Amino acid sequence: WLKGRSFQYGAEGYIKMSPGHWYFPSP
Amino acid sequence: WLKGRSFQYGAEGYIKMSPGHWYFPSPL
């Protein structure tokens, strides 16, 4: 999923699928 | 272009990350 995407890893992790799109993955 | 090693940058300089599975695809 994270080929060209920017994302934050750690406790509060998410993946920005777009400049205006957030994806919160369930553990 | 960094053959194997990888760093992260915050507030003091550079930190040597642990060896892991995922690598950063490098733009040049």
Next chain:
Amino acid sequence: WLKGRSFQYGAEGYIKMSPGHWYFPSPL
């Protein structure tokens, strides 16, 4: 290495991809 790019070498480094683009790999 860093073929047509300007950089700021030594212990806190960054490559300038464009005039308005900063990239922060390993300390160059």
Next chain:
Amino acid sequence: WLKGRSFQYGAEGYIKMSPGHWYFPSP
């Protein structure tokens, strides 16, 4: 008669055959 129609059943019953059309059936 009622396929895509909205209607009220019970004591006071009617069938809305359109957004502006009421059908009061005879008992």
Next chain:
Amino acid sequence: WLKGRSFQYGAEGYIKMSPGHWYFPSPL
């Protein structure tokens, strides 16, 4: 898409309706 069962909804949650012959044509 509901396979046989049907409920009605008002003011307290859902109520299991009595089994009859009429079924709701499902938009899905």
Next chain:
Amino acid sequence: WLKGRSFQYGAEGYIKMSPGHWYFPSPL
């Protein structure tokens, strides 16, 4: 199930068929 529709599950459920459309089946 509920192919691409967003829904709010548990004991008081509704499916959003569209940004301006609510559907109230059995509690998903």
Next chain:
Amino acid sequence: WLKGRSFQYGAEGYIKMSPGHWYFPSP
């Protein structure tokens, strides 16, 4: 390099590659 260019030699040498371009070599 210094065929059609104007430059200053001596202690602090530089080559004006253009009316709006300076080149500072490291000896």
Next chain:
Amino acid sequence: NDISLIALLAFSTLLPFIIASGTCFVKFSIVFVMVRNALGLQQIPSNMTLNGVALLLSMFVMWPIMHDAYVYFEDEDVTFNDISSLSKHVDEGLDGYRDYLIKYSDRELVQFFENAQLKRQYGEETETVKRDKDEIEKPSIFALLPAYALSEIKSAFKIGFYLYLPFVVVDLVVSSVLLALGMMMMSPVTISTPIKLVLFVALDGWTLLSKGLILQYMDIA
């Protein structure tokens, strides 16, 4: 302070002739008359509306340039205390329009007008300026927009030749298949006009040429 309003209203009155010459409306208007002429249609599509559709794209591109003028000139500290700094302020206000003229005008056609204006100014003894001025020196605002408007007429006719080509390839083969028969006394443009209209509506040249012109000034994402 009061005559700053005179300078504003005098700028206001000369506005649409600046839109007639200075902006890129001259690229859209010419190529839109050319796509009317190449199809053979004379009156339709009623060019009073074709001015409007060509104007709205040019305003749609010109809006970020003209918008910075309002925020720069509605500043409460326009009024300076020196006569040369106040004349400096209108130059650095006009620089965002002026480098736009620099980017889209021709090199040598701009370069010809300074040499032509200087020998009028002083005389023949003024030595000519070459290309090498470009790195430091800026031309005047009244020596740019002639060479700008000629360069944009060159680019609009450059576009207008290309889509004129796929219609005359049709108009020669129809005039040849009619002479393959013995139908010499026949007007071929009345048979050529349907298949000229199909080659533009099946190709849909409006909705890709319109994107092409906005791509010639701005980019997407």
Next chain:
Amino acid sequence: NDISLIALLAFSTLLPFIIASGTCFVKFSIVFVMVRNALGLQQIPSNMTLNGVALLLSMFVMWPIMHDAYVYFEDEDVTFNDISSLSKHVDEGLDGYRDYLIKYSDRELVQFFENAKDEIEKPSIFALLPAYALSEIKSAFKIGFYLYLPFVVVDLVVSSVLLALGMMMMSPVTISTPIKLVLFVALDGWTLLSKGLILQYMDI
């Protein structure tokens, strides 16, 4: 109220360009000329009396959009204490025009103009008015090819029956133009294309 007197005048002085570019008058005024060029006529009937009936025909299906903005803007709640709530109120008035434009414009082209779903927010009014006019000129060209097509056949068949005889040096425009318009009056094509042109936007 005094600033609204400007915008009320500013619509009125700009009306013959918005009606020139933002309605179906361009499609009616374009098909009514190529039917003359299809028949091989030049100045008959005019450019004036064809624009007049095209204006009234476009004024039928366009009047209820213009009519609702009156009755919506006559209401007493134009006094608002907030700047942005009045900006919302004038945004809520133009939705009769926006829903008219999105129906006949292309979503990809207006997405292109938007870059330089639609239920939560409507796209801006300047982002789609050329996309509407550029869609109407294309659709009027496409429908213009169709009714052009049967008169080519009468133009060809009499030129072939004259070439079937030896008379090859004979101008067929003096013979086809009689046969051209009887095809248009035995069809009674005038009273029916205005029908389906009205039915293309307004339902029965």
Next chain:
Amino acid sequence: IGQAVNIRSMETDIVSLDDRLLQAFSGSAIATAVDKQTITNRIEDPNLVTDPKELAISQEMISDYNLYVSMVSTLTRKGVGAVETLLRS
């Protein structure tokens, strides 16, 4: 004497065009509507009309309303005439 000012202007990049003009229109309509009341209730209040200290202010605000709306009238007239000269051809 009570005053208030807001300092930071809202500013961003909208590729949308009409809503900036809607904010310009509402910002002018409200500022011309609040002052027609402020001059009218200054004139119907019979205490303010008698004081020569308050009268010097009262002549000012009728000129500030006068020059403002006349400026927008002449700018728009040249604006709608400029588009007229290109489209009428």
Next chain:
Amino acid sequence: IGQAVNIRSMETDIVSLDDRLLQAFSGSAIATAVDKQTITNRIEDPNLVTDPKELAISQEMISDYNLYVSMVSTLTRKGVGAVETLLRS
């Protein structure tokens, strides 16, 4: 000197736009006829024009009568001017 008002504004269906315009014309010609005969009966009664309080009232009815018919005149003028440019094309 003892007045009356009517409260019913009836509605008849229009059968066309032509049927709409006949009501809008007849509804406006009555108001412009009545207000001018109101200001004449205000003037021709000479005891109304000698009192200070009724004079600003007649000033208001004057300025409304001028602004009403001037606003319908310029609007109908620009309306038929909008017709002429489209018919010229």
Next chain:
Amino acid sequence: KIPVTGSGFVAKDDSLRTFFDAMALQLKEPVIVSKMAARKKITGNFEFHDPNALLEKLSLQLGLIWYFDGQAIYIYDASEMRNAVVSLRNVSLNEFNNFLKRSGLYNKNYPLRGDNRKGTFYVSGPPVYVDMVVNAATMMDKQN
């Protein structure tokens, strides 16, 4: 002809105006829904056993505000809530708040926020509530 054994309303792609008119008999008052709040749609099998408790739950799930002024039930959507702050010269808040209770307009869900003996107070709610509160508080100081 109409076979369902219960007593309730079946809605198939309604438009929130024909829906609330079906509840306008079990509620004893007519319901008035605005224009922007009539573009949403509802479908499903409903049952109005008690409407004043059903309307509170649907007004929180759909996102809506409503108000009952003794004769009708106005319904707006949540993006139309207007707010305003207004001051009073010679009537206090405790005297103005008894006018609402004695009239029958004191809404306990949208109360009046402010200091107990002052001129200023902060009101917010539906537009039929705001243009009633601002006018009925302004027309009590011109009298005094």
Next chain:
Amino acid sequence: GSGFVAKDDSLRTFFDAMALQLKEPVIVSKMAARKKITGNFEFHDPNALLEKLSLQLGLIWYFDGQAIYIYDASEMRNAVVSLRNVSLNEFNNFLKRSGLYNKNYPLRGDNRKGTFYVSGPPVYVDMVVNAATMMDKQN
């Protein structure tokens, strides 16, 4: 348990589903309704989830007793206002006695003086400005 499964929702329909677990309606602005969210959320501590999401997406919010207004971060405005005959302390007592005191965006200024600095949501500052300038004219 309850919860919401958002799939490319438009951030107005996401906070409308939380308007039942929160007991008040939520009014999201126009510029703040362009971002999008997707994922599985569980509403069991909403006031702790609203602040954590409002700091990661970038938003400001203000609950005044009747609704929860939600803007984004680029719309925060500010002002400075001078009072002639009332001080800051009893105006803060007006906000504490009324219920409009917001501890995230307090008033910056000297404690018994005329000038102070306000910053917050646009529905907050137009109330504090209009309530402050309507107490000097009453006093």
Next chain:
Amino acid sequence: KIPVTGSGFVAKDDSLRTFFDAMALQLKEPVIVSKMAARKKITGNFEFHDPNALLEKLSLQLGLIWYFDGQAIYIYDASEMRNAVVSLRNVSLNEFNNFLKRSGLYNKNYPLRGDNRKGTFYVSGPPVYVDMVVNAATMMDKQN
């Protein structure tokens, strides 16, 4: 599906608006970045564990100015720094610096340059700091 178990933000060509809101939870205030400073881009692996020194280092390496007013963190570029000279008639500079110290709007990075007990001084900084200090020093003279 997410990589190595440390803490950090991976930036693959962001545009300084989606980057600082990721730092907007470690900073406990929202961050407002201007339009001229939102055209630059950044790429790399970053790690926030004390952000007030990281913002100080990146504001010098990229070229930026910033101001924390107690409720938000405004960020401008260096070409937006404005300055002004204002003269105080009826109050001094030390009695204005006590207002800035007691109000918590005092900033040691951009102090006030001037004589210690006079009326004229010199301010410079971000436009939200200059538009606050000019209007807050003019509105105190009309009080005195």
